[PDB]
Amino acid sequence: KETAAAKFERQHMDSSTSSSNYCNQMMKSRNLTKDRCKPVNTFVHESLADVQAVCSQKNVACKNGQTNCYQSYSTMSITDCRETGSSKYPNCAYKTTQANKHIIVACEGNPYVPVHFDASV
Hints:
By secondary structure, this protein is α+β, with helices and mostly antiparallel strands. 18% of the residues lie in helices and 34% in strands. The chain has helices at residues 4-12, 22-29, 48-52; strands at residues 40-44, 58-60, 69-71, 76-83, 94-101, 103-108, 113-120. It has a 4-stranded antiparallel beta sheet. It has a 3-stranded antiparallel beta sheet with strand order 1-4-5, covered by helices on one side. A hairpin with an 8-residue loop joins strand 2 (58-60) and strand 3. The protein starts with a helix and ends with a strand.
């Protein structure tokens, strides 16, 4: 069983890799369309070190009300994936959207690392 930190990396980190086919390929290769087409997801194109560093940056309230969320001081290169209308499982179709925004992640554990991607502002 992968750790919460490992799950975050799998679901949201892509420091290496875009095209309009990006989300269609990534959502599948990262196993986010295994038992269901995940409605939306975001990939971060920054180093693991830079994203992990966000846990010591701006503390803000999480969407669920918890207080362990942090916003990045600098904007980050990200890719937003949003499922289309004519998607329909098992052929999950996604709309790929690149953007540069600040990210908000929830952190926990020892070491204190990102475990949930809360939002992009």
